[PDB]
Amino acid sequence: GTAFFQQQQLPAAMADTFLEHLCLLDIDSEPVAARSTSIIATIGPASRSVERLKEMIKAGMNIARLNFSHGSHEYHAESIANVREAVESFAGSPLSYRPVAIALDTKGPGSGPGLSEQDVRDLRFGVEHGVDIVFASFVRKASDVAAVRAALGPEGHGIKIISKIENHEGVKRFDEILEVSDGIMVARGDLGIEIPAEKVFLAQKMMIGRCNLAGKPVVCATQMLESMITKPRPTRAETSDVANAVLDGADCIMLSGETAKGNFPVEAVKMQHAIAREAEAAVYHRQLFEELRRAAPLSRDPTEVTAIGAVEAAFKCCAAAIIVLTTTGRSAQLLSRYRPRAAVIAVTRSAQAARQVHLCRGVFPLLYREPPEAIWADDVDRRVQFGIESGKLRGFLRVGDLVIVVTGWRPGSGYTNIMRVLSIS
Amino acid sequence: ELGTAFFQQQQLPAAMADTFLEHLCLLDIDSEPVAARSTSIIATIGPASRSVERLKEMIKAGMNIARLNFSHGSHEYHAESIANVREAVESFAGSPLSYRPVAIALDTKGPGPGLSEQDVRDLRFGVEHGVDIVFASFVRKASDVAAVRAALGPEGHGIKIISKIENHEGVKRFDEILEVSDGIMVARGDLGIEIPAEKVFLAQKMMIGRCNLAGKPVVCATQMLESMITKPRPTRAETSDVANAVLDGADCIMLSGETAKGNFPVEAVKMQHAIAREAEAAVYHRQLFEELRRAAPLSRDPTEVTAIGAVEAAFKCCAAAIIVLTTTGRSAQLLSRYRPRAAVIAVTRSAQAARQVHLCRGVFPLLYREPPEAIWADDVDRRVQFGIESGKLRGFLRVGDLVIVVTGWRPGSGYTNIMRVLSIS
Amino acid sequence: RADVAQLTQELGTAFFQQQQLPAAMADTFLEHLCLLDIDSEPVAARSTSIIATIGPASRSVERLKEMIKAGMNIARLNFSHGSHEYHAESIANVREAVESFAGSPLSYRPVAIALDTKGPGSGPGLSEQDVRDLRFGVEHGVDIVFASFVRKASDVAAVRAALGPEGHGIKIISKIENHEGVKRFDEILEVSDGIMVARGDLGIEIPAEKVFLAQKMMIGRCNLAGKPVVCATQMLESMITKPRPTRAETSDVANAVLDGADCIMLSGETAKGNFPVEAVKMQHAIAREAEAAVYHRQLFEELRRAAPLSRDPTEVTAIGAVEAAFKCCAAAIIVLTTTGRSAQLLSRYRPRAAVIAVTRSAQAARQVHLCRGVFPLLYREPPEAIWADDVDRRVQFGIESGKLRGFLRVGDLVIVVTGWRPGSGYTNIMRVLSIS
Amino acid sequence: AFFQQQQLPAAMADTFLEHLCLLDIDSEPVAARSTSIIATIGPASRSVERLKEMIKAGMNIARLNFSHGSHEYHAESIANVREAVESFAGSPLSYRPVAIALDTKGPGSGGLSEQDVRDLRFGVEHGVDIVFASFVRKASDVAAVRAALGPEGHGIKIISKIENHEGVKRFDEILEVSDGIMVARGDLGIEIPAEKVFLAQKMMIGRCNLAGKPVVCATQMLESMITKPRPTRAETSDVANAVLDGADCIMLSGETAKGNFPVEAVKMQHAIAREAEAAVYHRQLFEELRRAAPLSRDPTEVTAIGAVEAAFKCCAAAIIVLTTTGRSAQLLSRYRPRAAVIAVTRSAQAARQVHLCRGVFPLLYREPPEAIWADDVDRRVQFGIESGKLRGFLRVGDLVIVVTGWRPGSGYTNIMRVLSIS
Ligand SMILES: O=C(O)C[C@](O)(CC(=O)N1CCN(S(=O)(=O)c2cc3c(cc2O)C(=O)c2ccccc2C3=O)CC1)C(=O)O
Ligand SMILES: O=C(O)C[C@](O)(CC(=O)N1CCN(S(=O)(=O)c2cc3c(cc2O)C(=O)c2ccccc2C3=O)CC1)C(=O)O
Ligand SMILES: O=P(O)(O)OC[C@H]1O[C@](O)(COP(=O)(O)O)[C@@H](O)[C@@H]1O
Ligand SMILES: O=P(O)(O)OC[C@H]1O[C@](O)(COP(=O)(O)O)[C@@H](O)[C@@H]1O
Ligand SMILES: O=P(O)(O)OC[C@H]1O[C@](O)(COP(=O)(O)O)[C@@H](O)[C@@H]1O
Ligand SMILES: O=P(O)(O)OC[C@H]1O[C@](O)(COP(=O)(O)O)[C@@H](O)[C@@H]1O
Ligand SMILES: O=C([O-])C(=O)[O-]
Ligand SMILES: O=C([O-])C(=O)[O-]
Ligand SMILES: O=C([O-])C(=O)[O-]
Ligand SMILES: O=C([O-])C(=O)[O-]
Ligand SMILES: [K+]
Ligand SMILES: [K+]
Ligand SMILES: [K+]
Ligand SMILES: [K+]
Ligand SMILES: [Mg+2]
Ligand SMILES: [Mg+2]
Ligand SMILES: [Mg+2]
Ligand SMILES: [Mg+2]
């Protein structure tokens, strides 16, 4: 229909130049796709009640950040419990259940050179309490990441390490840090104090671009809607900043004081949700996909190979979604790196992976709870049908839509290799 | 894993180039072609190439399609030629390494207002003798194609109609002619007489580009190696012309007097084979694929959607081949339209389709003769392995190579929707 | 590397590390972002003009002198507040502070004066207060009018009519503040001299989360049209009370420049803020960083692909001059202009070289601040008897001022844009000159 | 109607593929033929009357193959060429200069052969403009030819013929020290596999285009026309593709030296080149040439790109350039403008040598210098406009780009002007 091609900035996406693309942006072109940039919300006095946390999950919060610079282990354990209670209050309807990751933000070293003793204690707390992500403060070199990995021990092997770049050394040794990290956070608060305030946008734009190139999650953090700590609506600069972090290529956007101690924590999440949707529709996918494709090296990994084929096929048919079966979340991450306009609906039995895929832009995790079928092929089809039913319920899909289904040839992680074009019935 | 020596062959340094100009600068005479020759050779069969023994040498030299010019000879004469071609082709039906299906094409005499009386009789002859292709002479408008289609009696509806564009009206009505034809022949002999000789290259380049855009086979014909009718080696202009027809985007190249009446018919086939191999390696796939992609409209046909995904995946891993199961040849044709550097090995039970897919650049047909398995999925795997083993048998594949496998979800033509990444074992 | 090998040997590796030159050489936009370096210092003069709203915090002649030194190019008078007596006093103080530097014409900085109207209201036709304020502007010699709540092309015609016959030289920058203005943008831009993205009212009239779409669209269309575009409101809002801005604020300013804005504005930050000089200094610091980070390779190519063929020698000379400047890494493009049009046409192709515009018109020298990358020089000498000699004196004035202000150094290449006969509309010559 | 001619719909295309699709056989070429024709002079094309027909047909350079004939024979040919050329000198607004090129025999089993030294000394004594040096294998071979030309032969252009595998492999070092290259396909097709010659041709042309140096495509281009009045489909294709490859010059060997239709062969190359030049995808070409060309601090280099850019912007009919040595015109030519580069020069040798550069139309200025240098410059610019108007390049109302310098002499080009005709 003609009405379909007027929505989600499709006239601006068809443009032959980036300049023409900007000229074609329409304020009356409504976003249709689900919001793909994840929202990380910092937990605190303003956002700890189980009832408040339920409203924040409904508003769009995907990751709950526990800032270990404040409060005790007793405090942070109560936080975790409330978050888990609010998340599990929706587990009765598995077709609409939304998993929420739990991230531990470390205090950092200070006048010291290596992992603080407090950081070791907090890291072991995180492992003991089952945190999904670690935002490692003041990462200056690759050995800092290794020290955090060591402090997580053998049981914390599944936790994701997102290195916070907060100073000039971190920016200068970025490549070696990214290589050993699972992703990066652009920690603008300290970065804006350690380097000239007028140079932070260069570091942000550079780090996001390099993470996009590497296929690793990148978080944009600090003062994004700061005025919403006290004021019910944000400034013109604030909405612009959020929209531009998405347009830069950020996988996640964050709320610090806006959710931890503010008067508008649910309003702050709803505002980030509203802006991200508008900004994602305004992304110039034509140039973006082409540049991501050109820059990405040749691969002999079937998962990587299937991922680019699936993304290419999704663009060809205007696929509503790409449904992927994933154990560790890697298959979904590899789809996400090519920035498809189609939602990546990731069906997994791993609750940890379902929470951790929120770090990847455009990945919508679905936790499958049914016990395995005797016939493996039947188990696969049940999980694909689960993705279709959830996607239909949540508005991602309609009868007649085309979806790309990404699966593998045998059970267990590492074997994705099949891409099938599917019509929704 | 592949080695530096691999990346020096088949003009891979020139293929990596960021500009077309840099691409030309990087062409290396010492970079040997490795891939199988993808541009099919059409050889006109006449007194010089009629004998079963001569035809066997021509099949070994690279002839894929045998052309019978109904402007000369009789029905009795051409039926003898067809019988000899079929006898020479079936002499290799024992050894799968030597066996190659060869299409049989009837070139009509031409019209007068509408279809000639002789053309109706010759077209009826073609149907009765089971010809695969018709090169319809002097096609001027879409009604001419319809008249040929109508002449291909009740039994001839599967024959391919390749419209010969030989005059100014055919060039001017090209779009309407291509829409109703299976493909086009750039009939340069008459075209060089009907229009100024210095304008024929414009018509050739335009028609090839439009056929490439449409995804339909295009043949470059007449005087390609003319001097070789009397001389053992061609001129500098002749080798250039053949190389440039391939670089233009031609699916097939033709030999007329060179094979029909000349003194070196086998040498002419060998020469076209040698040049096509060099020219195909020198194709700038980076710009070509990107432009084919950008120009091709969005599609909701799973076959077309799977085809672009498969070609994308093949480029990503330097896939040795794309093995496709096809009944009509459509699935292979849709892969071919995106000009992959990988060979399209099409496994089919249809002998007609196996001969007709020679019209498509880079399609290597394999006729499957085994009786159907009780389990359809098992019948499918047996055909995929038939593809793989013959591939290994001919030097396309080695254990450890990556291949893209294109199949459908249910039997019968029209359901192609699966793309798998398989490692050769 | 071969496209810069000899020039790298000549200018030095240190030259090619500064002003984001490694990021500018990138083959893709993505690679360009990856190559941005915080250690790559900006060298070029700041090209995006700063508009500062003058109020109680920034009225004193001594304060205004510090703001001119900080980088203020245009002084804005908001006729929504204050009186005619109040605003006339502000204008007088601005003029006094500007003329305090007129003693050295090689370092004198012209400052434009802009009147921001109050706007219509519940009623549509030009308000009676607007007619009185527009008459005031004409009488006081304002250079620009920021026309509030422009909704259609007839609105801009009504403002031009209220300016009268004597206000023909004033520039009309239409403020787009509502949904109607955004929807009828093309018709408004056609009849306006430029546009202001009035984000304050725009953020109230349309959803706050959609304003960035309107900003990016309007800037792109103004860039396409070759007309000045201003980004306004809440750019450094927190600096009204604090000495340092938020991370979102510095980002917003940098992104307005990267979007393609010719001018950036300060409202409450300079009118009623506690740190008006610090706000100007902050916008100056960010704009310089952001201009160096512009991906000129794609930008110039897209401006050329989009721009239609032209048979106007001024337009033709402008693209040739910008192309030549990119080829040699020209330090500046010196242009002789009467109305500012020749400089405006150079500016539309977004050169990295500074457009040093030499003019005898004081009004045009102030008005060219609306054009990104145009550095106006007011020529005060009386005309030479030989016209060709008068032209060469003005070109030499530009070279001497350029050398004086640090724009030029011996050995630099400059592109000189002049015409074949006196008077406006005859620009058609481009020269490559080496600085001695 | 203007935008339907000279493949302008195909030139507006956003992709190369769309460009090919838009090529129109009914779109007539309007601009003058840019690719120069080199004709080998022999028994079939030696008469003064024959040579006059060949000049009118389009011959720009006359080649004398020193592999056959004697010094007495070739001197007679030179005299006949010069006589036929000077028969049109009466009308200087329509006079067409013709270069004279000596093609050496080569070293054969050997450094520089003794016959080559004698022939090179002959060329210097007879005032040849170009030398096509046979079998150039390395940079020292070029130096040996340069040395054999001596002090009197400093002005002669050396076009190195690449005829074997060593020449192809050491191409970069040879091009660096040569004025240009000839893709000598006859010997190349024997020295390397026949099916690999197109790779060497396309590579050499691209590299010469990149370097801004003339490249000639030679041998068997219209071979059948030695005995037949019309060429083959492959032959017309080959000529059109040499132009589309980026060749500055195309050559005729046996076709003009010993063939039955030498004038018809020249006419045929002229007809095809015109069609092929209009079909060039300038959008991609200029952009790639622009991107690839290095940054320069030479005002001639800088003015050249500005002039070509300005010409594309207004659909300039021509770019009129004042040149002493031909360098300023050569630098304009390297950016492949669609506008004709009308080069006004007082040097007769430079006027002949500029035929090596594609799209450069030399005009020999034969008026004595004015007292005021600025007035002398304007007279030469007006000469270009009058000759252009006469030859059909210009019409009143057209826009032209005028490229001049700030001071007399060679190496000072730095000015570009936009001028409206009449
Ligand atoms: O259109 C119209 O008709 C025109 C046209 O095209 C033109 C011409 O004439 N030609 C060309 C071609 N060729 S070749 O040599 O190649 C050839 C041969 C032959 C043939 C074929 C061919 O093909 C056969 O079959 C035969 C049969 C039997 C016997 C013999 C024969 C022979 O020889 C010829 C001549 C025609 O006619 O067709
Ligand atoms: O290089 C090396 O050595 C090679 C070679 O060279 C090769 C050959 O033989 N050929 C080729 C060429 N051709 S054409 O025709 O063109 C020609 C002819 C002529 C000429 C030239 C030319 O040129 C002259 O001069 C002359 C002179 C005198 C007399 C005569 C003549 C003639 O005819 C021939 C043949 C040898 O082998 O030897
Ligand atoms: O993204 P990952 O972790 O590699 O997991 C993908 C895996 O999931 C599957 O699709 C299904 O396997 P399971 O039945 O074990 O869930 C495999 O075929 C594939 O290896
Ligand atoms: O290219 P075509 O003619 O559509 O044939 C492709 C068909 O072949 C298959 O892959 C296998 O089908 P069959 O088992 O009938 O051969 C189908 O699933 C698919 O629709
Ligand atoms: O930019 P504008 O307004 O067209 O003015 C440029 C004009 O200035 C000149 O360079 C000098 O002219 P003046 O004698 O009027 O100062 C003219 O040649 C040209 O027409
Ligand atoms: O083309 P060349 O050899 O580099 O020199 C071109 C020269 O032509 C001129 O425009 C006119 O020079 P002349 O006065 O020597 O004829 C010079 O200013 C310029 O240097
Ligand atoms: O740690 C952070 O979030 C910061 O410093 O911005
Ligand atoms: O039939 C042909 O091939 C022709 O006419 O060129
Ligand atoms: O009018 C204004 O300045 C605004 O709305 O921002
Ligand atoms: O000398 C030549 O021209 C050749 O050998 O091709
Ligand atoms: K912390
Ligand atoms: K026929
Ligand atoms: K106001
Ligand atoms: K010779
Ligand atoms: Mg911090
Ligand atoms: Mg015919
Ligand atoms: Mg307002
Ligand atoms: Mg030779």
Side-chain angles (χ1 to χ4, degrees), chain D residues 63 161 163 182 184-187 219 251:
Chain D
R63 177 184 171 247
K161 299 167 61 181
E163 326 206 44
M182 184 197 288
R185 304 189 308 175
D187 283 293
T219 306
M251 206 171 87

Side-chain angles (χ1 to χ4, degrees), chain C residues 20-290:
Chain C
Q20 311 292 346
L21 288 174
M25 307 303 190
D27 309 302
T28 70
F29 184 61
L30 186 48
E31 184 189 345
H32 156 80
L33 298 173
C34 303
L35 293 168
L36 294 173
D37 191 351
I38 53 163
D39 293 344
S40 189
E41 297 304 324
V43 185
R46 195 247 311 152
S47 66
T48 306
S49 304
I50 298 169
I51 301 165
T53 303
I54 306 302
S58 51
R59 235 141 140 271
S60 70
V61 170
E62 315 79 73
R63 182 56 64 84
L64 286 163
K65 283 177 196 183
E66 289 167 319
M67 303 237 315
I68 289 166
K69 283 152 44 176
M72 175 191 60
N73 309 106
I74 303 168
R76 177 185 171 247
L77 306 161
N78 189 11
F79 275 61
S80 280
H81 310 309
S83 68
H84 281 209
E85 197 179 59
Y86 189 88
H87 290 316
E89 201 176 343
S90 300
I91 295 170
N93 285 7
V94 163
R95 290 174 172 166
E96 180 178 335
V98 174
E99 297 316 305
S100 82
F101 307 98
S104 170
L106 251 78
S107 49
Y108 168 81
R109 296 164 272 185
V111 169
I113 291 176
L115 190 146
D116 191 301
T117 76
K118 201 167 191 171
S122 326
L126 201 58
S127 77
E128 283 175 342
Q129 191 177 345
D130 281 4
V131 176
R132 295 188 288 263
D133 298 349
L134 286 170
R135 273 175 189 161
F136 173 99
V138 173
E139 286 163 6
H140 288 259
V142 305
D143 305 289
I144 306 136
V145 165
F146 294 138
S148 296
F149 266 84
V150 174
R151 272 177 300 240
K152 54 202 103 225
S154 71
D155 289 359
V156 357
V159 173
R160 183 100 273 171
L163 285 168
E166 291 303 302
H168 65 283
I170 298 177
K171 297 292 182 169
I172 302 173
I173 301 299
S174 296
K175 299 167 62 179
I176 308 297
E177 326 207 44
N178 64 356
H179 183 263
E180 205 193 348
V182 175
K183 288 290 123 186
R184 303 168 80 86
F185 178 81
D186 292 337
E187 81 174 67
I188 295 168
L189 178 59
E190 188 70 33
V191 300
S192 307
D193 292 300
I195 291 293
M196 184 197 284
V197 182
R199 304 190 305 179
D201 282 292
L202 206 44
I204 291 163
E205 303 286 332
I206 81 166
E209 70 273 12
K210 293 184 167 292
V211 179
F212 82 94
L213 295 158
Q215 174 184 323
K216 292 173 179 280
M217 175 276 293
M218 294 191 272
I219 298 180
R221 287 192 193 172
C222 290
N223 284 194
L224 220 327
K227 295 197 168 169
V229 64
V230 177
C231 181
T233 308
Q234 298 187 333
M235 304 203 82
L236 294 181
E237 197 78 341
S238 85
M239 296 186 74
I240 290 172
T241 54
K242 309 164 161 266
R244 316 289 297 151
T246 77
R247 307 307 180 274
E249 285 163 359
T250 68
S251 137
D252 177 55
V253 173
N255 277 305
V257 174
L258 293 168
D259 284 348
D262 291 86
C263 300
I264 50 175
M265 206 170 87
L266 291 166
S267 299
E269 308 103 297
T270 50
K272 261 267 99 100
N274 294 340
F275 303 77
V277 178
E278 290 82 10
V280 174
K281 283 178 168 166
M282 186 47 74
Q283 281 204 329
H284 168 84
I286 309 165
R288 282 242 291 152
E289 294 288 353

Side-chain angles (χ1 to χ4, degrees), chain B residues 138-161:
Chain B
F138 265 87
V139 173
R140 310 176 238 78
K141 55 202 104 224
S143 71
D144 288 359
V145 185
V148 176
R149 190 88 66 185
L152 291 167
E155 323 87 354
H157 304 321
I159 296 177
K160 297 292 177 170
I161 303 173

Side-chain angles (χ1 to χ4, degrees), chain B residues 206-351:
Chain B
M206 174 278 293
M207 294 191 270
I208 297 182
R210 287 193 192 171
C211 289
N212 286 192
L213 222 321
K216 296 198 169 169
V218 65
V219 178
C220 180
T222 307
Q223 298 185 341
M224 303 204 81
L225 293 182
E226 199 76 341
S227 86
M228 289 188 60
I229 291 172
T230 60
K231 311 203 196 65
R233 299 204 309 113
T235 79
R236 304 311 178 272
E238 284 163 0
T239 69
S240 136
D241 177 57
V242 172
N244 276 308
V246 175
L247 293 170
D248 285 349
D251 292 84
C252 300
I253 50 175
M254 206 171 85
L255 291 165
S256 303
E258 307 104 299
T259 52
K261 76 177 189 188
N263 290 325
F264 310 89
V266 178
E267 288 79 13
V269 175
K270 283 179 168 171
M271 182 54 69
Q272 281 206 328
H273 169 84
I275 308 165
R277 267 199 112 202
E278 295 291 347
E280 287 143 20
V283 160
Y284 189 33
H285 289 99
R286 175 177 291 207
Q287 176 161 8
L288 179 56
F289 181 55
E290 242 163 49
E291 290 194 344
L292 284 170
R293 234 165 69 227
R294 243 174 84 104
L298 298 178
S299 179
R300 304 242 309 168
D301 175 42
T303 312
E304 181 84 69
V305 173
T306 304
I308 192 160
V311 169
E312 181 70 80
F315 275 122
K316 180 68 165 179
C317 62
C318 268
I322 303 175
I323 299 171
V324 61
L325 257 56
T326 191
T327 303
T328 70
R330 188 174 164 256
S331 300
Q333 180 171 3
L334 300 188
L335 286 164
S336 174
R337 81 172 291 170
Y338 296 104
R339 295 290 195 248
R341 184 180 288 272
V344 175
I345 299 178
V347 182
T348 188
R349 275 193 175 104
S350 177

Side-chain angles (χ1 to χ4, degrees), chain A residues 5 16 286 289-290 293-294 296-302 304-306 308-310 312-318 338 400-402 404 417-422, chain B residues 1-2 7 18 284 286 289-290 293-294 296-300 302 304-306 308-309 312-313 315-318 338 400-402 404 417-422:
Chain A
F5 285 106
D16 310 300
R286 173 176 293 208
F289 181 53
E290 246 164 44
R293 274 210 330 105
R294 247 178 192 250
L298 299 175
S299 178
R300 300 245 303 157
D301 175 44
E304 182 93 48
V305 176
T306 305
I308 192 161
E312 177 69 81
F315 275 122
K316 183 69 177 186
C317 65
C318 252
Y338 296 104
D401 273 338
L402 274 183
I404 306 296
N417 76 314
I418 307 161
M419 177 238 115
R420 116 174 66 102
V421 184
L422 185 57
Chain B
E1 29 188 346
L2 298 178
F7 285 105
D18 309 301
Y284 189 33
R286 175 177 291 207
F289 181 55
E290 242 163 49
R293 234 165 69 227
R294 243 174 84 104
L298 298 178
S299 179
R300 304 242 309 168
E304 181 84 69
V305 173
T306 304
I308 192 160
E312 181 70 80
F315 275 122
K316 180 68 165 179
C317 62
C318 268
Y338 296 104
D401 274 340
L402 274 184
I404 308 299
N417 76 315
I418 304 164
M419 184 263 295
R420 305 128 66 177
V421 179
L422 290 213

Side-chain angles (χ1 to χ4, degrees), chain B residues 67 69-71 107-110 137 164:
Chain B
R67 177 183 171 247
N69 190 7
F70 274 61
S71 277
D107 192 300
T108 76
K109 201 166 193 168
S137 294
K164 299 168 61 180

